[PDB]
Amino acid sequence: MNLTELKNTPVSELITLGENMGRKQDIIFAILKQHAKSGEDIFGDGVLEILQDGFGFLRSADSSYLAGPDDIYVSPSQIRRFNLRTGDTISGKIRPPERYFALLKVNEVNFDKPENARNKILFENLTPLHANSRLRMERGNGSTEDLTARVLDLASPIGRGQRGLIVAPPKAGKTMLLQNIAQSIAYNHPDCVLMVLLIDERPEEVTEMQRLVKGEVVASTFDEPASRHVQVAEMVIEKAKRLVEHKKDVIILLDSITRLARAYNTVVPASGKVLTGGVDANALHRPKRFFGAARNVEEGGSLTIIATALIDTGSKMDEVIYEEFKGTGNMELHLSRKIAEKRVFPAIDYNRSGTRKEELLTTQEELQKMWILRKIIHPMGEIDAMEFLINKLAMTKTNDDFFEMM
Amino acid sequence: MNLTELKNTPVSELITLGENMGLENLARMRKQDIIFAILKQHAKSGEDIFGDGVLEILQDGFGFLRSADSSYLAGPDDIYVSPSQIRRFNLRTGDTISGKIRPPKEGERYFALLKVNEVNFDKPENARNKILFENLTPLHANSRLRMERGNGSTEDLTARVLDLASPIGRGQRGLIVAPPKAGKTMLLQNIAQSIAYNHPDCVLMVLLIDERPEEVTEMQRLVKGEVVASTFDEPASRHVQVAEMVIEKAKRLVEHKKDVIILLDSITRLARAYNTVVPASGKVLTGGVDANALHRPKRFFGAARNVEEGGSLTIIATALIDTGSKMDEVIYEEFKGTGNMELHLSRKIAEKRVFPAIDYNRSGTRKEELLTTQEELQKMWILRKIIHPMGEIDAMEFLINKLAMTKTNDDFFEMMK
RNA sequence: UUUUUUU
Ligand SMILES: Nc1ncnc2c1ncn2[C@@H]1O[C@H](COP(=O)(O)OP(=O)(O)O)[C@@H](O)[C@H]1O
Ligand SMILES: Nc1ncnc2c1ncn2[C@@H]1O[C@H](COP(=O)(O)OP(=O)(O)O)[C@@H](O)[C@H]1O
Ligand code: BEF
Ligand code: BEF
Ligand SMILES: [Mg+2]
Ligand SMILES: [Mg+2]
């Protein structure tokens, strides 16, 4: 008997058990309470958020990890006993309430025994590194969607702990690029913990993502205030850090981080100093720490963040935000509006796209092939570049056979 | 028996060492407690204890010996230095101190300093009589700090082009100016390697402010020197205090006639941190910089100088431009009017994967005749006249191909004839 | 007011 499981099952399945014992939120509360009279075990789970007083609540993914009526109370002694912090996934027995359910004991901390999670190294003390193991994006299945992933592997490689972004103007193909990322992440690397954080973007894109991606989708559409965007993103990035502390390879696909930085700018207190474009002089610190959370860890695991970014918006702010994040991350995949307006996809700007320390992600042969191909494409215009590379790649199914044509 | 030596050793060797002394079970308690209990037991035997750290004098007249593992911030193992000890040897903030220590007594929370054995790697008496950094007579850089390895390395190309475009002397006040992803950090790393090989006599420090954390570990495992860092995970308040400790430590070593070099990355972000903590003056410059915000970072950069009495302080720091934020153009141009050397890197050259992506015409060093021989300057002068009409990319492709033909710039000069 | 608007 689990709480969040009762919330998932339809109300019809609920009334069946409730009548046998004797709103949907109340009938669940009545089933759990009457069951507590029997003396049998009752359960609940969630992602922890530690308040200022020292206690915490297990937030629900249904509420985008915000406050909810079905949230479980976590006492400070429980947090101290297992050294819990915000972002930890906690499961265990609870008790009927006083207007809040309360956790009796925790069985699993981050899908693992609670005792093992106590002597772990904190995320801040993990030794950072440049990305070693690479996340190759190519499916090699011969599909038209694979072309996007194949050009990405040549232009800007992605590794574990990468801190990259997809820069483009509106309607250039950022989101669809990111959807193409998710498909290759789940098909090529099922081992990775895939999360998709959608901030201040379209409402049809989260439902499309929820059914397209194999993973978790946390969203906060543009129907939501900027303060909600910040709180939702903080919960997600803290949950990612906790899994990295358990040596997990977490990947966050953010869309968009430029709008996430805007939300911070609208929230930060006015400092009396404003950068070019209307960005407060202290507004970009927290977005830098968010994006900058992605890193490769020597002790094990990694956190990878690939986020979409806006440029050529006519607003100087987004140019400042892009350049700031560029100086924070180590990978950029640019997309040109001129290429996208000619219906040439992917609309990748090859000469601007690139990845730092790409030798740590590529074989020596692969590095030379991409180096030569880099020099050949550079003199061409951006449209002529893609149309040239699309045809050469279309001739073959995989990049390896393309390397052999050279 | 030293505190920081015990902090460096792994916990496994500490527990075994503590059990040999015969102590209550050390496996449960934290590593900090193992060291503390091990230090106390050694004090019970009557044997001496030792500690060390860089001094930071508080407002009340006493100070503490901060440790490098805390980025010279407040630490649990800080050693109290009494005011009488400071007056005896005229100690000031930044002085590296080593001496005998004792565990804290009842009602105390810190290790205390009994006797100071070494002040700035020297006899404590010599520190009493000294000329202060503020009174040292400044000079333009005299002694050349040549970066060229000469080993025919492909990485040496960056050092060779640097020597021709913007020479570096002892006491230089230089800038590696470029937009993001142009090659500033790796060029600073290339400089760090050249300093460790060609100038092991110099005291090398690498200060990393508000930059990537993976570059911190990359730097400390690459350079043969001390690395102090404060990544972008840290607030601006921490950046300032860490930078102030490092710059004062450099001034103290220069007072001992040492040649100190500080590779800072980035100084633009250090200037932003000062602008974050500066008191509002009611006057804001173009780009969102307070009218009084750049005085402190200007004195920091301006600390680099050549000293006639002996020693020097060199600072090679990276700066950002073309960020879309006018603030960084103000910060860069303000530092250019403070320093005397700029090595520009071009995003246009870097996008073509041409490295080092050096803007030759914009780079340069002031009073470079004081750092070059008569014929070396005449050869660099002719080389600039030839390179100037070329484009940014054509200039580097031309110069790198010519330099790659030879191992050293000297042989390259002999080819020019 | 300055900064932002703003080149
Ligand atoms: N790989 C692709 N193949 C075909 N069409 C594409 C592709 N990528 C983008 N597009 C076109 O671009 C339009 C908008 O792309 P989108 O990903 O929403 O850009 P952005 O996220 O930058 O707004 C889509 O309607 C689609 O028709
Ligand atoms: N000398 C060089 N040789 C090869 N690649 C370089 C060189 N300098 C820079 N790069 C490439 O540029 C990327 C970023 O350079 P970096 O030094 O971080 O620039 P910045 O410090 O200005 O951001 C590196 O990851 C590297 O791939
Ligand atoms: F309209 Be796109 F998502 F920038
Ligand atoms: F992004 Be670079 F380090 F300026
Ligand atoms: Mg989109
Ligand atoms: Mg850098």
CB–CB of B343/B363 below 8 Å? yes
If residue B101 lies in a helix (H) or strand (E), which one and from where to where? strand B96-102
b (16+ CB within 10 A) / e for A23-40: eeeebbbebbeebeeeee
d(CA A393, CA A154) in angstroms, rounded, equals 11
Q: Which of A288, A289, A319 sits opposite B324 (nearest CB)?
A: A319
Nearest nucleotide from residue A271 CA, by C1' atom: C3
Q: Which residues from chain A sit within 8 angstroms of residue B217, using beta carbons? A: 127-129, 298
Side chain identity, residue B195: I
**DSSP per residue, B172-223:** -EEEEEE-TTSSHHHHHHHHHHHHHHH-TTSEEEEEEES--HHHHHHHHTTS
If residue B161 lies in a helix (H) or strand (E), which one and from where to where? helix B156-165
B21 belongs to an annotated ligand binding site: no
Structure tokens at B417: 């004839």
Return the number of other C-beta atoms located less than 10 Å from residue B315's C-beta: 27
DSSP state of A23: -
Nearest to B408 by CA among B161, B186, B197: B161
Return the number of other C-beta atoms located less than 10 Å from residue B75's C-beta: 18
Positive/negative CA dihedral, A372, A378, A379, A382: positive
Q: Best mutation site among B155, B158, B181 for ligand 2, i.e. most ligand atoms within 8 A of its Cβ?
A: B181
CB of A323 nearer than 7 A to strand C? no
Contacts of residue B153, Cβ cutoff 8 Å, sequence gap at least 6: none
What are the angstrom distances between the C-alpha of A364 and each of A29, A361, A369?
61, 10, 9
Identify any residues that bridge with A310 across adjacent strands, giving them in sequence order: A168
According to CATH, the superfamily of the domain at B130-417 is P-loop containing nucleotide triphosphate hydrolases (3.40.50.300)
Structure tokens at B380: 């660099």
Structure tokens at A177: 């690029």
Nearest to B103 by CA among B46, B17, B39: B39
Q: Does the beta carbon of B182 sit less than 6 angstroms from any atom of ligand 2?
A: yes
**DSSP per residue, A115-181:** TTTTSPPPGGGSPEE---SB------S--TTHHHHHHHHHHS--BTT-EEEEEE-TTSSHHHHHHHH
Residue with tokens 């790409």: A358
CB of A276 nearer than 7 A to strand C? yes
Which regions of chain A carry the CATH code 2.40.50.140?
Answer: 2-119
Nearest to B81 by CA among B68, B91, B72, B67: B91
Residue with tokens 């801190």: A163
CB of B377 nearer than 7 A to strand C? no
Q: Does the beta carbon of B269 sit less than 6 angstroms from any atom of ligand 4?
A: no
Which residue ranges of A are tagged as binding site for ATP? 159-164, 171-176, 202
At B167 the three-state DSSP class reads coil
d(CA A266, CA A225) in angstroms, rounded, equals 10
CB–CB of B291/B251 below 8 Å? no
Q: What CATH number should be reported for the domain whose range is A2-119?
A: 2.40.50.140
Identify any residues that bridge with A102 across adjacent strands, giving them in sequence order: A73, A95
- Tell me which of 3.40.50.970, 3.40.50.300, 3.40.50.20, 3.40.50.1370 is the CATH number of domain A120-404: 3.40.50.300
Smallest CA separation from ligand 2 atom 4, residue: B355
What are the angstrom distances between the C-alpha of B134 and each of A257, B255, B299?
47, 10, 12
Structure tokens at B124: 């404590």
Contact (CB<8Å) B325/A275: yes
Tell me which method was used to determine the 3D structure.
X-ray
**DSSP per residue, B262-282:** EEEE-HHHHHHHHHHHSPP-S
Smallest CA separation from ligand 3 atom 2, residue: A170
d(CA B343, CA B366) in angstroms, rounded, equals 12
Nearest to A109 by CA among A94, A123, A93, A88: A88
d(CA A304, CA A323) in angstroms, rounded, equals 19
CB–CB of B211/B199 below 8 Å? no
CB–CB of A244/A110 below 8 Å? no
Residue with tokens 């649990």: B76
d(CA B186, CA B273) in angstroms, rounded, equals 23
d(CA B2, CA B18) in angstroms, rounded, equals 14
Which regions of chain B carry the CATH code 3.40.50.300?
Answer: 130-417
How would you classify the pairing of strands A89-95 and A43-50?
A: antiparallel
Q: Best mutation site among B186, B187, B321, B323 for ligand 2, i.e. most ligand atoms within 8 A of its Cβ?
A: B186
How many alpha carbons fall within 13 Å on the CB side of residue B166?
Answer: 25
Structure tokens at A266: 């609208």
Residue with tokens 């610190």: A285
Structure tokens at B354: 């041409």
Which residue ranges of A are tagged as binding site? 159-164, 171-176, 202
Q: Is B94 left (phi over 0), alpha (psi -120 to 50) or beta?
A: left
Q: Does the beta carbon of A311 sit less than 6 angstroms from any atom of ligand 1?
A: no
Position in ligand 1 atom list of the atom nearest CA A147: 1
**DSSP per residue, A180-249:** HHHHHHHHH-TTSEEEEEEES--HHHHHHHHHHSSSEEEEE-TTS-HHHHHHHHHHHHHHHHHHHHTT-E
Instruction: Output the distance from B282 CA to C2 C1' rounded to whole Å.
Output: 7
Residue with tokens 């699993």: A108
CB of B22 nearer than 7 A to strand C? no
Structure tokens at B357: 């992506």
Which regions of chain B carry the CATH code 2.40.50.140?
Answer: 2-129
Nearest to B332 by CA among B291, B357, B290, B301: B301
Top CATH class of B2-129 equals mainly beta
Q: Residue B266: closest CA among chain A residues belongs to which residue? A: A327
Nearest to B227 by CA among B235, B216, B237, B236: B216
Which regions of chain A carry the CATH code 3.40.50.300?
Answer: 120-404
Structure tokens at A181: 């990322």
Instruction: Output the distance from B284 CA to C2 C1' rounded to whole Å.
Output: 5
CB of B109 nearer than 7 A to strand C? no
